[PDB]
Design a protein. Structure first.
Ligand SMILES: NS(=O)(=O)c1ccc(NC(=O)NCCO)cc1
Ligand SMILES: NS(=O)(=O)c1ccc(NC(=O)NCCO)cc1
Ligand SMILES: [Zn+2]
Length: 257
């Protein structure tokens, strides 16, 4: 099965998922001087006031905080997007060390972690249909640097002891994802893919310029999770990030000068 180890990590994925070598793969390096400011880009509209978180799940590759996506409760609109995209889950990718962990990079800089708020285009009815479409998903990516704690992350941090191993889930209601956002919603955008198998080329990536800061203790708690199931040999869930992929025939656009 695919993973992030020596024998099943990102360099092996193409053997089962040949789209890994496709034309619009993610993540990418964001070369900030080559990105083009597009004044026709609209501000992002993040409407999370009615969000309903339900559960948190260790899926063996990351942990997902899942939301009720059966109504337009937490939606992303505007920016480069046409129509309305519903929040289904968020998760993170992180490193074994503060010097690495993000999937996207900025002028080759790696951040300690990267948050992905995953949304699907309501015109396609559900997530499974949306991933089959070139405009099916919008993923809002937010970098994490280590410094001051992020108070809105602590509720996530504190439940991780309950989902240490693959397949464990826990109730996780009333979590407000607005507590994970930075001040500014300035962003870069480009067409790309899921960054894990099946690597489907269905994502409008929206990557925020401003990172959030989390404490060293917060990210250390991410690194105590396990990729394995309970009663299997323990392998720490760290370095669950795919490296930057070739940009190919793509231009990254910026919402800001
Ligand atoms: N990254 S990938 O192409 O999906 C892949 C799948 C299986 C493996 N190896 C495997 O299954 N070995 C048997 C031990 O469990 C390695 C990589
Ligand atoms: N890292 S990423 O490109 O944001 C990503 C998002 C969703 C998936 N797959 C998925 O099934 N998401 C919804 C889970 O219920 C895989 C990769
Ligand atoms: Zn992700």
């Amino acid at each position: 099965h695919w993973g992030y180890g020596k024998h099943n990590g990102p360099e092996h994925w193409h053997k089962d998922f040949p789209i890994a070598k496709g034309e619009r793969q993610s993540p990418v390096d964001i070369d900030t001087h080559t990105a083009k400011y597009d004044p026709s880009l609209k501000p992002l509209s993040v409407s999370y006031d009615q969000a309903t978180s339900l559960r948190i799940l260790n899926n063996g590759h990351a942990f997902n905080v899942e939301f009720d996506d059966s109504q337009d409760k937490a939606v992303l609109k505007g920016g480069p997007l046409d129509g309305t995209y519903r929040l289904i889950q968020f998760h993170f990718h992180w490193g074994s060390l503060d010097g690495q962990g993000s999937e996207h990079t900025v002028d080759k800089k790696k951040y300690a972690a990267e948050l992905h708020l995953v949304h699907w285009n309501t015109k396609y009815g559900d997530f499974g249909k949306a991933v089959q479409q070139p405009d099916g998903l919008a993923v809002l990516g937010i970098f994490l640097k280590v410094g001051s704690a992020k108070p809105g992350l602590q509720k996530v941090v504190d439940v991780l002891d309950s989902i240490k191993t693959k397949g464990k889930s826990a109730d996780f209601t009333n979590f407000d994802p607005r507590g994970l956002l930075p001040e500014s919603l300035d962003y870069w955008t480009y067409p790309g893919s899921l960054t894990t198998p099946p690597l489907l080329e269905c994502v409008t990536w929206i990557v925020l310029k401003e990172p959030i800061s989390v404490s060293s203790e917060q990210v250390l708690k991410f690194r105590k999770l396990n990729f394995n199931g309970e009663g299997e040999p323990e392998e720490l869930m760290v370095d669950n990030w795919r490296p930057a992929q070739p940009l190919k025939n793509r231009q990254i656009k910026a919402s800001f000068k």
